[PDB]
Design a protein around this motif. Structure first.
Motif, short mmCIF file in Angstrom:
data_model
loop_
_atom_site.label_atom_id
_atom_site.label_comp_id
_atom_site.label_asym_id
_atom_site.label_seq_id
_atom_site.Cartn_x
_atom_site.Cartn_y
_atom_site.Cartn_z
N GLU A 23 -2.12 -1.39 -1.55
CA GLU A 23 -2.73 -2.43 -0.74
C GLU A 23 -2.03 -3.77 -0.95
OE1 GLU A 23 -4.75 -5.32 -0.80
OE2 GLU A 23 -5.13 -5.13 1.35
N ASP A 24 -1.64 -4.07 -2.19
CA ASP A 24 -1.09 -5.40 -2.46
C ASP A 24 0.32 -5.55 -1.92
OD1 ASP A 24 -3.45 -6.09 -4.11
OD2 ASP A 24 -2.54 -4.77 -5.61
N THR A 25 1.22 -4.62 -2.27
CA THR A 25 2.62 -4.78 -1.92
C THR A 25 2.84 -4.65 -0.43
OG1 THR A 25 2.88 -2.46 -2.54
CG2 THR A 25 3.58 -4.12 -4.14
N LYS A 26 2.03 -3.83 0.24
CA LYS A 26 2.13 -3.74 1.69
C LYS A 26 1.61 -5.01 2.35
CE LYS A 26 -0.90 -1.47 3.77
NZ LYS A 26 -2.24 -1.66 4.40
N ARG A 27 0.65 -5.68 1.72
CA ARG A 27 0.18 -6.95 2.24
C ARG A 27 1.24 -8.03 2.10
NH1 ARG A 27 -4.11 -9.97 0.37
NH2 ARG A 27 -4.41 -8.45 -1.31
N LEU A 28 2.03 -7.96 1.03
CA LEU A 28 3.23 -8.77 0.94
C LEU A 28 4.23 -8.36 2.01
CD1 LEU A 28 4.76 -10.97 -0.63
CD2 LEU A 28 5.70 -9.14 -2.05
N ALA A 29 4.31 -7.06 2.29
CA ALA A 29 5.21 -6.58 3.33
C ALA A 29 4.66 -6.88 4.72
CB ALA A 29 5.46 -5.08 3.16
N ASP A 30 3.37 -7.17 4.82
CA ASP A 30 2.85 -7.73 6.06
C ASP A 30 3.07 -9.23 6.12
OD1 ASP A 30 1.75 -5.23 7.09
OD2 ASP A 30 0.15 -5.47 5.59
N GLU A 31 3.25 -9.87 4.97
CA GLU A 31 3.33 -11.33 4.95
C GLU A 31 4.77 -11.81 5.06
OE1 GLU A 31 1.16 -14.30 4.79
OE2 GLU A 31 3.22 -14.72 5.41
N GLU A 32 5.65 -11.33 4.18
CA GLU A 32 6.97 -11.94 4.07
C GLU A 32 7.84 -11.56 5.26
OE1 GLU A 32 8.77 -11.10 0.32
OE2 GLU A 32 10.28 -12.68 0.48
N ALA A 33 7.47 -10.51 5.98
CA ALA A 33 8.14 -10.22 7.24
C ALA A 33 7.70 -11.21 8.31
CB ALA A 33 7.85 -8.79 7.68
N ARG A 34 6.40 -11.50 8.40
CA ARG A 34 5.93 -12.39 9.46
C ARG A 34 6.21 -13.84 9.10
NH1 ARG A 34 -0.60 -11.55 8.74
NH2 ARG A 34 -0.57 -12.00 6.49
N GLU A 35 6.47 -14.12 7.82
CA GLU A 35 6.97 -15.43 7.46
C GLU A 35 8.44 -15.57 7.85
OE1 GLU A 35 8.98 -16.43 4.46
OE2 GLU A 35 8.82 -18.54 5.05
N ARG A 36 9.17 -14.45 7.83
CA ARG A 36 10.57 -14.46 8.24
C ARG A 36 10.71 -14.74 9.72
NH1 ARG A 36 14.03 -11.05 11.79
NH2 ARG A 36 16.13 -11.06 10.86
N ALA A 37 9.74 -14.30 10.52
CA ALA A 37 9.78 -14.58 11.95
C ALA A 37 9.59 -16.07 12.23
CB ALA A 37 8.72 -13.76 12.68
N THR A 38 8.74 -16.72 11.44
CA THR A 38 8.55 -18.16 11.59
C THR A 38 9.77 -18.91 11.10
OG1 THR A 38 7.36 -18.06 9.50
CG2 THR A 38 6.07 -18.12 11.52
N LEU A 39 10.40 -18.43 10.02
CA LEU A 39 11.63 -19.05 9.56
C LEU A 39 12.76 -18.74 10.53
CD1 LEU A 39 13.60 -20.37 7.49
CD2 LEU A 39 13.42 -18.28 6.13
N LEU A 40 12.71 -17.58 11.19
CA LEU A 40 13.60 -17.34 12.31
C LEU A 40 13.19 -18.18 13.51
CD1 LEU A 40 16.07 -15.72 12.98
CD2 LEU A 40 14.61 -13.91 13.89
N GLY A 41 11.91 -18.55 13.57
CA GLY A 41 11.43 -19.33 14.69
C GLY A 41 12.00 -20.74 14.70
N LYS A 42 11.89 -21.45 13.59
CA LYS A 42 12.37 -22.82 13.55
C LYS A 42 13.89 -22.86 13.57
CE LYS A 42 8.66 -23.34 10.34
NZ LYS A 42 8.02 -24.07 9.22
N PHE A 43 14.54 -21.83 13.04
CA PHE A 43 16.00 -21.76 13.05
C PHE A 43 16.53 -21.63 14.46
CE2 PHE A 43 20.08 -19.67 12.55
CZ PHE A 43 20.65 -20.41 11.56
N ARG A 44 15.94 -20.73 15.24
CA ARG A 44 16.34 -20.63 16.63
C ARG A 44 15.76 -21.78 17.44
NH1 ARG A 44 19.15 -16.32 14.30
NH2 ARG A 44 20.04 -15.02 15.96
N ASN A 45 14.76 -22.47 16.90
CA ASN A 45 14.36 -23.72 17.51
C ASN A 45 15.37 -24.82 17.22
OD1 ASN A 45 12.80 -25.70 18.82
ND2 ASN A 45 11.74 -26.21 16.91
N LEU A 46 15.89 -24.87 15.99
CA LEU A 46 16.70 -26.01 15.59
C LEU A 46 18.14 -25.85 16.05
CD1 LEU A 46 16.11 -28.62 13.86
CD2 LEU A 46 17.07 -27.38 11.91
N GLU A 47 18.50 -24.68 16.55
CA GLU A 47 19.81 -24.59 17.19
C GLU A 47 19.76 -25.18 18.59
OE1 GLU A 47 21.68 -20.39 16.25
OE2 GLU A 47 19.56 -20.49 15.70
N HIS A 48 18.57 -25.21 19.18
CA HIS A 48 18.47 -25.46 20.62
C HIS A 48 18.74 -26.91 20.95
CE1 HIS A 48 17.03 -26.09 24.59
NE2 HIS A 48 15.87 -26.60 24.20
N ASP A 49 18.28 -27.83 20.10
CA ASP A 49 18.64 -29.22 20.31
C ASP A 49 20.07 -29.49 19.87
OD1 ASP A 49 18.08 -28.84 17.66
OD2 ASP A 49 16.82 -30.61 17.42
#
Lengths: 49, 49
Positions: B23-49
């Motif tokens: 339960e714990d490590t998969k919850r990290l695997a639910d978290e750090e993947a979806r945190e990577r999308a947000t870090l991919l989010g601002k990165f593909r945001n910050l290329e745009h300007d």
């Protein structure tokens, strides 16, 4: 003594099933931790310049 | 049977241990993947300007 080993023999798969299932999710968390350093490393310089 | 009641308690606490750990490590695997999308989010945001 027969019902105990029949309780063992079904549990013996469960120990093997979870130790593989853990490391599959663990290497997912391991490779992701190797990923997020490089991408955030690609962020903290790119926000600077 | 003394080997059993020792061991059938022994691996039994291993299972009720690891069913929390999956339960714990998969919850990290639910978290750090979806945190990577947000870090991919601002990165593909910050290329745009």
């Amino acid at each position: 003594l027969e019902e105990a080993e029949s309780q063992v023999s079904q549990l013996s798969k469960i120990k093997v099933s979870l130790t593989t299932q853990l490391e599959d999710t663990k290497r997912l968390a391991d490779e992701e931790a190797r990923e997020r350093a490089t991408l955030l490393g690609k962020f903290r310089n790119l926000e600077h310049d």
